[PDB]
Amino acid sequence: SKTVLDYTIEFLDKYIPEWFETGNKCPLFIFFSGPQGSGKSFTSIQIYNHLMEKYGGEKSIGYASIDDFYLTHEDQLKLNEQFKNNKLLQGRGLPGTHDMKLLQEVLNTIFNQDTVVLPKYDKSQFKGEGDRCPTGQKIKLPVDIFILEGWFLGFNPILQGIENNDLLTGDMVDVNAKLFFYSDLLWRNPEIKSLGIVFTTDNINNVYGWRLQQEHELISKVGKGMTDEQVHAFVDRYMPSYKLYLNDFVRSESLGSIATLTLGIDSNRNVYSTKTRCIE
């Protein structure tokens, strides 16, 4: 049976060459989006390698996880107080906890030396609170293909009647405002041409399961991790976002400006359905 990888490679091996046949010198972005635990991270990494091997020296390939752009430990502390009463913004995690100014600059440089520098993060820092690495990564300019991945890529801010939406309340109000900067800068940015890989599942509560598994394995290995109660508390921080944006995002099939591949997977990460939308 075909895995998510099989479908993804199939989709990209058709569309990437078709993009190059256009002669476009601007970068081609490739966005990977999927709930935490869906395996989208591993899949994006596999594609990175796939492209590195296929095009190797004839094309410049870049890769980054949106979390590579988390705020410096210090700035997150600043963010904590700034939104002292918003529990969703305390600590790295939700939209608004990333360094947008830095992302803005990188994008600027890309669409502009011989290399551009992207940040790298270290989550083990400050007893697990995390901090930015003293040294990131360097990508050769111009960039031909740029792979970016995150669990909320493609989500769009609620723009109208934000006081009537029941899901959009409390701490989510600021999160929604924060989400704007990513959307505006990336998947809603008219200058960005891209292919999208979307992972969705039959039940969103699969996310709890997937993280409960991950943590149980860590504990059985080093006797340290969150209690199930804490794992629930952890995931609960992301559920509001899922409930608010996942539907429009996935149903819209437009993470990619050129084409989008949507994959539906079950608890065992098994594919039950596939769909490719090529923006008409």
Q: Angle of helix 4-20 relative to helix 40-55, nearest 10 degrees?
A: 40
At 265, is the secondary structure helix, strand, or coil? Answer: strand
Contact 30, 47 (CB under 8 A): yes
Q: Structural domains in the chain?
A: 1-280 (3.40.50.300)
Annotated binding site: 34-41
Annotated binding site for ATP: 34-41
Contact 97, 79 (CB under 8 A): yes
Distance linking the first and last C-alpha atoms of the chain: 30
Tell me which residue of 50, 37, 44 sits closest to 269, measured CA to CA. Answer: 37
How far apart, in whole angstroms, are the C-alpha atoms of residue 175 and residue 160?
Answer: 15
How far apart, in whole angstroms, are the C-alpha atoms of residue 42 and residue 148?
Answer: 12
Provide the resolution (angstroms): 2.2
Q: Which amino acid is at 258?
A: I
Is the Cα dihedral 54, 59, 60, 65 positive or negative?
A: negative
Element (H, E) at 273: strand 271-277
